[PDB]
């Protein structure tokens, strides 16, 4: 346990410790000390936008309708959930995570169509 | 039918306010502006077009101004701090005629690296730096500066080259546009867009007439707070640019001597080649026809009557001479060859200039700078963009108005950019009754 | 939390009488103070109960004429405990009322059964004789 | 069409576009104002619809009813023949009554909740 | 007929529920001077996400009141809620539990991670 | 009552190389004698 002490875990069993990572994430030399608490905060609200925008806040783990593309890779769930860690995942896909975002921003905007009506 | 308070988010609604603007630059001497500070900007910025959308602006209350100007004096200030004090320049001087009068021969005991030894330095100053010590002996002077400040020397190192800033609004907040074809800075404009950030705006700092900024796109557009009140500032925008070429034709030989460790003073040693005043040149075809077509707008607001146009009637020569930058030297030119004409509705222009070495752009009392001296010819262009014009009032005769060039308030020459923009706050959130009503368990 | 009372005495028939209740070890202002009688004759009998709080009182029919309930402004401890007197005045005292009279602590600070006595002191006796 | 395109739509029109709007040493000092600034803006609109319950959803239907003194107009009359910037003048005086009462609704309606899941 | 802010706080803990709206508004509304004043607007910021990062990781956020999975030890208190809701104010309660605040904290997170966990099987089943 | 003292001293000038003499009245309390006690001169506290 502790912060991080699954990044060497498969990603299956590294989901275990999402609460771990997803706490800490916050907490002349006056402006400087203040940049960097700004900065923790910003990094801190922008992935909470991400999440919002994806209709995901409030989740730590989050279904979505966008179709997994097999270009991005070819590999089998067991493959990927058993015999990797996130950090060579997010390597593989390291070239396609903005389309994905976009994908899924995309998703959600159709979402909020149907549900209009 | 029951209606029910609904919550929505998104909703597009403003009001005027009051925010920090940040600069934003293109990625690219040190420049005065610090403009290498600036966030850069985007490769292709957006704008929106609101349909439906009238807008009031008032250029004259748009506090982007104010803080834009905030922003030039402290830039200005900044880039003194680390500079030689020049401290030990103000002594007395003895002066002779060098080898106009618009120049003298200085000599003056500076001081060295050792404060147990000084040195005889001869320099040339301008005659506007110097003021005589009345011994009425002729032969005494001291640099203007004395009684009021001290001053400090800009460094070499500096450049005051403008470059464009971008002035960019924090998320949550926006910039609206006036796109009216033709718009006098006040009262509403039909054609709003929307705009994360300004065009880039010149820093660009004048006393008559305004120089390389925005033109006009159809016809000549004259603004003022009120026409009928002559003390107000009028502000004139061109269609087409006066090109204005400027000349100091003098070879200048810089020199410099050690004042004490760590600092350097830099002066003109000599002038190689005859000694010859500086000038500028506005083309006389072009001038003509860019103050006729300024006179029949202006003729508009005054009931048909002759428009007169004459010279400042005194002052600080801040107020009554055309100022500018120009290669770093500092340029004072007398304007009284274009600004003297009658108009009745039925080759170049040459200017005198005169340079200063000590100034005070910003009429401040307490403070001062010293330029150094920039060696060799220098050489500039311009484009005249817009005229900053005043009224003699007072008078009830109805057959001609008398207009004369410049004003005090420096405030003005960014108003001739930011006039088109209006800051104001977003507000997302509102309320309104739908027949939608919220589920609950059970 | 602890009650104290006056202690015994004898009195004449027609005579008033004052007994005191002091208290510690919790917010008197926060609990009603209750009087209960017990005699032989009767068994216990409520007198009714005051709320320091308000100064609010809710006399038992039997008692309304000669029964007076009063309370001291509390002087604090701990920023959660206090001290502070309650008092009982009887007047017009018969051979009837004499039997053990106890002061009471209220049960909670809200809910339905918040002047329940859930303390109560160690009482003492009132006896009237000629 | 884009960030407050709808500004001269009616209400009803511009519903559409809530998404599209529901995102979004010396120059670094005003930048690091510019920054904090942004901030604050972007969470004070947060705390209130996180209070509301309506958070995560660009429109939100809540349990109070609407007073006829703060508009005393119909559905048709606001909805389309309205921009939301009139609007926004004709309630600036009740927005804030409003808000409340949209908060203290919101504690009635958790408060029974809770005590339907206490009874199963 | 709002008691103000903080006027639940002498209140019983029952009845301060009734005013959580009161307290969870404002939590952000309310030259050597102009550092100062940055500095406070900072400090505020991080204080209202402090607790909020917390509510997002519980699944709690959005709701002023907020239910969960994990039971109550017995440890941490061994009182019935009457005397819980009903005699005391929260001041009181926050003591008596104090040192156990950032146990129930972790139990709660732990609880939330394999609730989603098991919700995203129950889908993967579907 | 030395509440007073009338000051003399050669001040310096807008140009380093001139001085000027200045006349002032200073409070005794400011005023420090100079420790060669010749009781004519002082200085500054
Ligand atoms: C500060 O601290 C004080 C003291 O702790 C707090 O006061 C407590 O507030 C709670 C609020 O719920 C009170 O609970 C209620 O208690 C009453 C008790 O009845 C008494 O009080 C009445 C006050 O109006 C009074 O009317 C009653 O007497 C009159 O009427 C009777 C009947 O006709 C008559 O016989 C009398 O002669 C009087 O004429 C009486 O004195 C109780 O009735 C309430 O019941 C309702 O509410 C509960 C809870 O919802 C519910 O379960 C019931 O079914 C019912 O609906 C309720 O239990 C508590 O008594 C107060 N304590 C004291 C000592 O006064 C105060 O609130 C704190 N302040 C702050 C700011 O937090
Ligand atoms: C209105 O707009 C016009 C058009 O933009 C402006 O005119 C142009 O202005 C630029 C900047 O002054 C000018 O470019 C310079 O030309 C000079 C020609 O002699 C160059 O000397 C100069 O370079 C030197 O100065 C720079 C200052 O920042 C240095 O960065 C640069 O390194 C050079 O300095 C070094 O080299 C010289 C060599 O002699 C040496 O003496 C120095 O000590 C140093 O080592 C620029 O290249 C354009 O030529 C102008 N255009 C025209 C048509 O004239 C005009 O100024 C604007 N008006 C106002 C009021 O802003
Ligand atoms: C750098 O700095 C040095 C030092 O200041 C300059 O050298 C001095 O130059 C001045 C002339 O410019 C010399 O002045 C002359 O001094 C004579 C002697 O002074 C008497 O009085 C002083 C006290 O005041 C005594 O110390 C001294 O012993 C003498 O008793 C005067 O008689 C001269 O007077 C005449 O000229 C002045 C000019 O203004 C007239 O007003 C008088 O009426 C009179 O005609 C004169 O004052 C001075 O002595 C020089 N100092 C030294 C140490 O040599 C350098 O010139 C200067 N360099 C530059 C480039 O400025
Ligand atoms: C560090 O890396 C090692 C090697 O990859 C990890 O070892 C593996 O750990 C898992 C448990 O986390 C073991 O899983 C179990 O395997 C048995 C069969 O051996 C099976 O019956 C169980 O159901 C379960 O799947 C796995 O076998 C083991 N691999 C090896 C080769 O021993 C280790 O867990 C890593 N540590 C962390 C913290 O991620
Ligand atoms: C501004 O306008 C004046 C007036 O038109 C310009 O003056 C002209 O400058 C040129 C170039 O220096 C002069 O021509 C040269 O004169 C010398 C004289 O010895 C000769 O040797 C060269 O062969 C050449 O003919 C010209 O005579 C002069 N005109 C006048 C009336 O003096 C000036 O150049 C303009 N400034 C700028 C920046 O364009
Ligand atoms: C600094 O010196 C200059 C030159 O002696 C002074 O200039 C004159 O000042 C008077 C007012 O005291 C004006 O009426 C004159 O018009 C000034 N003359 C010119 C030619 O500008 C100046 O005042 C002095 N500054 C101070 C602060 O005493
Ligand atoms: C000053 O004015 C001249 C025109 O008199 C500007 O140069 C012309 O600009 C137009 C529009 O960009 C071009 O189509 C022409 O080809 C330009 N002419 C030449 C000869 O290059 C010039 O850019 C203006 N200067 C400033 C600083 O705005
Ligand atoms: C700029 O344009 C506005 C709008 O046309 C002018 O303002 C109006 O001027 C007329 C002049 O007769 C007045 O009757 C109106 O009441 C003005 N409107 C408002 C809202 O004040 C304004 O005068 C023009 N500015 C200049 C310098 O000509
Ligand atoms: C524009 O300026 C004129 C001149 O200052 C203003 O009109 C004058 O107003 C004063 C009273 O404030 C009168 O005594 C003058 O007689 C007026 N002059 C004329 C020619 O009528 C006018 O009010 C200003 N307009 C605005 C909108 O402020
Ligand atoms: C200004 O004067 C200087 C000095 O005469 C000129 O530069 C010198 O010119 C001679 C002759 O070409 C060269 O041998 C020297 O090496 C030059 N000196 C330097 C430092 O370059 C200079 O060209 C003149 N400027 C103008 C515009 O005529
Ligand atoms: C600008 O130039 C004009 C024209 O040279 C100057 O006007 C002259 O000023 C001198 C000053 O001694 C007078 O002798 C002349 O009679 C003036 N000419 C006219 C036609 O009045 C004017 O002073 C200059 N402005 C500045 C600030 O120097
Ligand atoms: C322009 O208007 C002024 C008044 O504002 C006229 O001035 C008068 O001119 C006559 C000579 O024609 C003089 O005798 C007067 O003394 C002048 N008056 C003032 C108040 O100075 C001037 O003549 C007019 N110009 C034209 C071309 O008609
Ligand atoms: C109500 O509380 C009274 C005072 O005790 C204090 O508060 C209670 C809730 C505990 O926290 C205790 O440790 C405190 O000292 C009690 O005297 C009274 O009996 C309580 N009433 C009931 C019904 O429990
Ligand atoms: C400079 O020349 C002018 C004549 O042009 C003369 O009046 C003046 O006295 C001279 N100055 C000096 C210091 O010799
Ligand atoms: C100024 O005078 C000094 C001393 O006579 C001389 O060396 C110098 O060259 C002069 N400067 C000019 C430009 O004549
Ligand atoms: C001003 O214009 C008149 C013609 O209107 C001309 O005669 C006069 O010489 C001009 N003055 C100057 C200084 O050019
Ligand atoms: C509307 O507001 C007024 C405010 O005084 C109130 O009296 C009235 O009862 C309210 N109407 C409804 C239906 O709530
Ligand atoms: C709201 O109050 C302002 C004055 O503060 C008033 O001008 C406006 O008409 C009021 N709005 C309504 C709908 O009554
Ligand atoms: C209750 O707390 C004790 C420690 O006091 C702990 O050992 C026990 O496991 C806890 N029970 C639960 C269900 O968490
Ligand atoms: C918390 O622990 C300390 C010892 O570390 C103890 O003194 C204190 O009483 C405890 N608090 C509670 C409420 O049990
Ligand atoms: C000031 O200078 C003069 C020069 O003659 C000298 O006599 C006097 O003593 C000086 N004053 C002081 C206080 O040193």
């Known amino acids: 346990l502790g912060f991080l002490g699954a990044a060497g875990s498969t990603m299956g069993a590294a989901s275990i410790t999402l609460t771990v990572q997803a706490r800490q994430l916050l907490s002349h030399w006056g402006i400087k000390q203040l940049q960097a608490r700004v900065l923790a905060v910003e990094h801190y609200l922008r992935d909470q936008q991400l999440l919002g925008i994806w209709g995901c806040s409030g989740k730590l783990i989050c279904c979505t309708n966008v179709p997994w593309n097999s270009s991005w890779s070819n590999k089998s769930l067991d493959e990927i959930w058993n015999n990797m860690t996130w950090l060579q995942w997010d390597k593989e896909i390291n070239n396609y995570t903005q389309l994905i975002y976009r994908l899924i921003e995309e998703s959600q905007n159709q979402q909020e169509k149907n549900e209009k009506e | 039918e029951n209606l029910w308070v609904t919550v929505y988010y998104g909703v597009p609604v403003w009001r005027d306010a009051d925010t920090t603007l940040f600069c934003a630059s293109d990625a690219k001497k040190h420049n005065v502006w610090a403009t290498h500070a600036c966030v850069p900007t985007d490769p292709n910025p957006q704008e929106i077009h609101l349909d439906n959308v009238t807008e009031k602006f008032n250029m004259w209350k748009n506090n982007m101004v104010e803080q834009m100007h905030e922003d030039i004096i402290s830039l200005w200030d900044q880039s003194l701090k680390p500079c030689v004090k020049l401290t030990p320049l103000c002594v007395t001087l003895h002066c002779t005629n060098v080898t106009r009068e618009g120049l003298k021969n200085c000599s003056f005991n500076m001081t060295t690296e050792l404060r147990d030894k000084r040195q005889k330095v001869y320099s040339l100053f301008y005659r506007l730096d110097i003021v005589p010590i009345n011994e009425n002996q002729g032969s005494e002077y001291r640099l203007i500066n004395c009684n009021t400040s001290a001053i400090t020397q800009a460094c070499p190192k500096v450049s005051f080259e403008p470059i464009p800033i971008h002035y960019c609004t924090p998320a949550g907040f926006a910039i609206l546009k006036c796109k009216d074809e033709g718009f006098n800075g006040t009262g509403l404009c039909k054609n709003v867009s929307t705009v994360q950030c300004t065009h880039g705006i010149k820093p660009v700092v004048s006393t008559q007439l305004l120089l390389n900024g925005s033109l006009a796109e159809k016809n000549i557009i004259i603004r003022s707070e009120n026409i009928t009140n002559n003390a107000k500032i009028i502000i004139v925008q061109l269609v087409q640019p006066v090109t204005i070429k400027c000349i100091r034709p003098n070879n200048n030989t810089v020199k410099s001597i050690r004042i004490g460790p760590g600092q350097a003073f830099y002066y003109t040693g000599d002038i190689i080649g005859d000694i010859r005043q500086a000038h500028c040149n506005v083309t006389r075809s072009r001038w003509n026809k860019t103050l006729q077509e300024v006179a029949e707008k202006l003729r508009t607001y005054f009931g048909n009557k002759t428009i007169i146009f004459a010279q400042s009637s005194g002052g600080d020569l801040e107020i009554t001479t055309h100022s500018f930058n120009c290669g770093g030297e500092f340029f004072y030119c007398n304007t009284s060859g274009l600004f003297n004409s009658t108009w009745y509705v039925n080759d170049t222009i040459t200017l005198p200039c005169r340079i200063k070495q000590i100034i005070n752009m910003w009429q401040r009392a307490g403070q001062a700078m010293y330029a150094p001296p920039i060696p060799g010819v220098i050489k500039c262009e311009s484009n005249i963009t817009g005229l900053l014009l005043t009224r003699d009032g007072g008078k009830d005769n109805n057959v001609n108005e008398t207009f004369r060039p410049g004003g005090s308030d420096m405030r003005d020459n960014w108003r001739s950019e930011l006039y088109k923009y209006k800051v104001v706050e977003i507000e997302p959130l509102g309320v309104a009754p739908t027949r939608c009503k919220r589920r609950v368990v059970e | 939390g602890q009650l104290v009372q006056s202690g015994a005495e004898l009195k004449k028939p027609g005579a008033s009488v004052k007994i005191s209740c002091k208290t510690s070890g919790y917010r008197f202002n926060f609990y009603h103070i209750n009087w209960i009688r017990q005699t032989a004759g009767r068994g216990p009998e409520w007198m009714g109960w005051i709320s320091p709080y308000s100064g609010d009182k809710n006399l038992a029919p039997a008692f309304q004429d000669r029964v007076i309930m009063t309370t001291d402004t509390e002087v604090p401890v701990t920023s959660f405990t206090s001290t502070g007197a309650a008092y009982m005045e009887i007047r017009n005292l018969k051979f009837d009322d004499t039997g053990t009279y106890f002061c009471?602590?209220?049960?909670?600070?809200?809910?339905?059964?918040?002047?329940?006595?859930?303390?109560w002191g160690q009482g003492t006796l009132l006896t009237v004789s000629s | 069409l884009g960030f407050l395109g709808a500004a001269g739509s009616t209400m009803g029109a511009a519903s559409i576009t809530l998404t599209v709007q529901a995102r979004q040493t010396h120059w670094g000092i005003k930048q690091l104002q510019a920054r904090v600034l942004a901030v604050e803006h972007y969470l004070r609109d947060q705390q209130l619809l996180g209070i509301w319950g309506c958070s995560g959803k660009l429109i939100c239907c809540t349990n109070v009813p609407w007073n006829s003194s703060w508009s005393n107009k119909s559905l048709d009359e606001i909805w389309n023949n309205m921009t939301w910037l009139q609007w926004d003048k004709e309630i600036n005086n009740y927005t804030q009554l409003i808000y409340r009462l949209i908060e203290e609704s919101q504690n009635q309606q958790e408060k029974n909740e809770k005590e339907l899941l206490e009874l199963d | 007929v709002s008691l103000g802010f903080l006027g639940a706080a002498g209140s019983t803990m029952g009845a301060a529920s009734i005013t959580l709206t009161v307290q969870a508004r404002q939590l952000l509304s309310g030259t050597h001077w102009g550092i100062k004043q940055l500095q406070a607007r900072v400090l505020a910021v991080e204080h209202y996400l402090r607790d909020q990062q917390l509510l997002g990781i519980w699944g709690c956020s959005g709701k002023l009141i907020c239910c969960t999975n994990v039971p109550w030890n017995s440890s941490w208190s061994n009182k019935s809620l009457d005397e819980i809701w009903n005699n005391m104010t929260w001041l009181q309660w926050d003591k008596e539990i104090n040192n156990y605040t950032q146990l129930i904290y972790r139990l709660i997170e732990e609880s939330q991670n394999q609730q989603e966990k098991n919700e995203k099987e129950l889908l993967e089943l579907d | 009552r030395e509440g007073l003292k009338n000051c003399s001293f050669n001040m310096t000038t807008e140009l380093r190389d001139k001085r000027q003499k200045v006349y002032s009245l200073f409070y005794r309390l400011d005023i420090v004698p100079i420790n060669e006690n010749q009781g004519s001169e002082y200085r500054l506290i």
């Open positions: 009471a602590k209220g049960l909670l600070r809200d809910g339905s059964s918040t002047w329940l006595p859930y303390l």
